């Protein structure tokens, strides 16, 4: 029910204040606080994002919610508590982790992502699916990013909410991330209401490239204008910012932004030039890709940019399309 959803949100927003205190003031939170500070989190940024610490007792959140008069089973359904199925007892889902509030599109806290700071697995532990937290619907930072996304007519998609936090403070405001999932049909429906331009900046590794191609292809097929920023090998946006600084990052992002078709053929360059079977298949793929582009201006430019990779004239490629 809507009333229960609201109670679940309240539980999240109230425990947030306690996690924040635990992180910033208490003895047990000191090591987690140092960890964040060493990753460049200022006191201001920690306060701004409402970041906190979940103690290791296993009954910190449980006891707080109980004292405040919440139904414990509802707190379990809200994904704040876990249940020992053997004796039906409840305990904290999040223990000894740095707590990042996850806000819905309306800015209400509906879940958490808890990061280890001691090399434990999983590195990030999220809320489970609940009536108020659904990974296929939530986009980290969307609440804050919406204004600039509309103003700039562009959304930028990163892999990690940590990348989003760092990019945002660096000056790149129109950024969001999924909670570690593939961009959903639902996400895409939300996004197209805000803008038709989406820029993918995944990590600069093989996995990120594969994800860029798969996600980009689907976005393109869905009628969006897709762009790609390619980070240096082995780097994500947080690592780039840490090594080169904010101004370098915002300049980098603004300098090399390529239409998806151009990015794709550049990735396939060597295979196309060495394997005639791939040459033919990718010439047809890229022809199809370009034919999907809704922007007549960008479609014409992509033709010019892609043709050389096949050693054909832009006129020949235009004909193939
Ligand atoms: N095996 C996995 N299963 C589910 N989600 C994952 C997995 N690996 C990564 N993710 C999610 O994808 C996003 C990107 O992961 P990645 O490890 O690159 O994060 P990150 O920002 O590098 O983390 P950190 O900088 O804190 O080490 C993260 O937010 C994470 O939640
Ligand atoms: Mn990766
Ligand atoms: Mn990363
Ligand atoms: Mn990282």
Swiss-Prot record:
Any GO molecular function: DNA-directed RNA polymerase activity
Catalytic activity: ssDNA + n NTP = ssDNA/pppN(pN)n-1 hybrid + (n-1) diphosphate
Catalytic class of the enzyme: transferase
Residues binding Mg(2+) 2: 203, 205
Toprim domain ranges (all copies): 153-234
E.C. number(s) listed in UniProt: 2.7.7.101
Cofactor descriptive note: Binds 1 zinc ion per monomer. Binds two Mg(2+) per subunit.
Cofactor: Zn(2+); Mg(2+)
Annotated residues for binding of Mg(2+) 1: 159, 203
GO BP term (any one): DNA replication, synthesis of primer
Highest taxon in the source lineage: Bacteria
GO cellular component terms listed in the entry, alphabetical order: cytoplasm; DNA-directed RNA polymerase complex; primosome complex
Key words of the record: DNA replication, DNA-binding, DNA-directed RNA polymerase, Magnesium, Metal-binding, Nucleotidyltransferase, Primosome, Transcription, Transferase, Zinc, Zinc-finger
Function recorded in the entry: RNA polymerase that catalyzes the synthesis of short RNA molecules used as primers for DNA polymerase during DNA replication.
Domain characteristics, as noted in the entry: Contains an N-terminal zinc-binding domain, a central core domain that contains the primase activity, and a C-terminal DnaB-binding domain.
Subunit-level organization: Monomer. Interacts with DnaB.
Family from the record: Belongs to the DnaG primase family.
Record-given protein name: DNA primase
Organism expressing this protein natively: Staphylococcus aureus
Organism lineage: Bacteria, Bacillati, Bacillota, Bacilli, Bacillales
Whole-protein coverage range: 111 to 428 of 605
């Amino acid at each position: 029910s809507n009333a229960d959803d609201l109670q679940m949100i309240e539980m999240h927003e109230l425990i947030q204040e306690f996690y924040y205190y635990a992180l910033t003031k208490t003895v047990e939170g000191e090591q987690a606080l140092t960890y964040l500070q060493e990753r460049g989190f200022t006191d201001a940024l920690i306060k701004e994002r409402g970041i906190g610490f979940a103690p290791d007792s296993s009954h910190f959140c449980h006891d707080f919610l109980q004292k405040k008069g919440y139904d414990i089973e509802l707190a379990y359904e809200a994904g704040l508590l876990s249940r020992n199925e053997e004796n039906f007892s409840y305990y904290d889902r999040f223990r000894n982790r740095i707590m990042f509030p996850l806000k819905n599109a309306q800015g209400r806290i509906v879940g958490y992502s808890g990061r280890t700071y001691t090399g434990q697995e999983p590195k990030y532990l999220n809320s489970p699916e609940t009536p108020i937290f659904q990974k296929r619907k939530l986009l980290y930072n969307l609440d804050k990013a919406r204004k600039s996304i509309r103003k700039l007519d562009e959304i930028v998609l990163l892999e990690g909410f940590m990348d989003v936090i760092k990019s945002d403070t660096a000056g790149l405001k129109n950024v969001v991330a999924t909670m570690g999932t593939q961009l959903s049909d639902e996400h895409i429906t939300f996004i197209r209401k805000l803008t038709s331009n989406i820029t993918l900046m995944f990590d600069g590794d093989f996995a990120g490239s594969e994800a860029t191609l798969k996600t980009g292809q689907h976005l393109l097929q869905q009628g969006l204008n897709v762009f790609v920023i390619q980070l240096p090998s082995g780097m994500d946006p947080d690592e780039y910012i840490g090594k080169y600084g904010n101004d370098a990052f915002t300049t980098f992002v603004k300098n090399d932004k390529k239409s998806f078709a151009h990015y794709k053929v550049s990735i396939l360059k060597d295979e196309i030039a060495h394997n005639d079977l791939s040459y033919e298949r990718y010439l047809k793929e890229l022809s199809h890709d370009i034919s999907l582009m809704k922007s007549s201006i960008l479609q014409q430019k992509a033709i010019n940019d892609v043709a050389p990779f096949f050693n054909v004239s832009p006129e020949q490629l235009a004909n193939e399309i």
